[PDB]
Write an enzyme that holds these catalytic residues in place. Structure first.
Site, PDB file in Angstrom:
ATOM      1  N   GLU A   1      99.351 -25.212  76.603  1.00 60.61           N
ATOM      2  CA  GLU A   1      98.558 -25.601  75.427  1.00 60.61           C
ATOM      3  C   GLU A   1      97.713 -24.514  74.761  1.00 60.61           C
ATOM      4  OE1 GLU A   1      99.108 -28.320  73.881  1.00 60.61           O
ATOM      5  OE2 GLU A   1      99.933 -29.726  75.333  1.00 60.61           O
TER       6      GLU A   1
ATOM      7  N   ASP B   1      98.623 -28.118  65.473  1.00 61.55           N
ATOM      8  CA  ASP B   1      99.516 -28.030  66.628  1.00 61.55           C
ATOM      9  C   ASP B   1     100.965 -27.818  66.173  1.00 61.55           C
ATOM     10  OD1 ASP B   1     100.596 -30.620  65.941  1.00 61.55           O
ATOM     11  OD2 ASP B   1      99.705 -31.595  67.660  1.00 61.55           O
TER      12      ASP B   1
HETATM   13 CL   LIG Z   1      98.518 -26.303  71.594  1.00 55.99          CL
END
Ligand SMILES: [Cl-]
Ligand SMILES: *SCC1=CC(C)(C)N(O)C1(C)C
Ligand SMILES: [Cl-]
Ligand SMILES: [Cl-]
EC number: 3.2.1.17
Length: 164
Positions: free
Chosen positions: A11, A20
């Site tokens: 992440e 994202d």
């Molecule tokens: Cl991310």
């Protein structure tokens, strides 16, 4: 290696609101704020999440706090889900981490829908499960990350994460 280190690798860490892989406002260690195209809406969610007027920037400690809550939520979600719980319970600790990873990325309902893959995992048909998991929008949109998670399910080792 552990679920926290694994997800931290997958992440990243960003202290300012960013979009994202799906173009959704996110912050910290993959903390999804909203699917809304409104930055203001995202800032409102952020402020509510942190408990203060942030104006789109948080500290590392704050990012880690949301992360801890999100990991806990993913685990909690797996255990409350009728489809995910038996699979999770049947797995070793390394493979449990792989399942948590998927839930963190796509949500409880999303992973619960992988009926055929889940059955193969439950059956401990590792190579078959790995082949089935790759036949997905998930794999096609985020292939490097999906490959790591799938390798973890196939081998029950942290091989895909040790040089990262
Ligand atoms: Cl991310
Ligand atoms: S999904 C199993 C599989 C089939 C084939 C197309 C032969 N492959 O290269 C792999 C091993 C991915
Ligand atoms: Cl939250
Ligand atoms: Cl990827």
């Amino acid at each position: 290696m552990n679920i926290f280190e694994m997800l931290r690798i997958d992440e990243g860490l960003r202290l300012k609101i960013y979009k994202d892989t799906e173009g959704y406002y996110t912050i910290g260690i993959g903390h999804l704020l909203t699917k809304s195209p409104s930055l203001n809406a995202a800032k409102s969610e952020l402020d509510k999440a942190i408990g203060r007027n942030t104006n789109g920037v948080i500290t590392k400690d704050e990012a880690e706090k949301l992360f801890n809550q999100d990991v806990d939520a993913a685990v909690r979600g797996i255990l409350r889900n009728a489809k995910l719980k038996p699979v999770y319970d049947s797995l070793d600790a390394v493979r449990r981490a792989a399942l948590i990873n998927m839930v963190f990325q796509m949500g409880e309902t999303g992973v619960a829908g992988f009926t055929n893959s889940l059955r193969m995992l439950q059956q401990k048909r590792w190579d078959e499960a790995a082949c089935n998991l790759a036949k997905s929008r998930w794999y096609n949109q985020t292939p490097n990350r999906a490959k790591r998670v799938i390798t973890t399910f196939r081998t029950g080792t942290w091989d895909a994460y040790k040089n990262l």
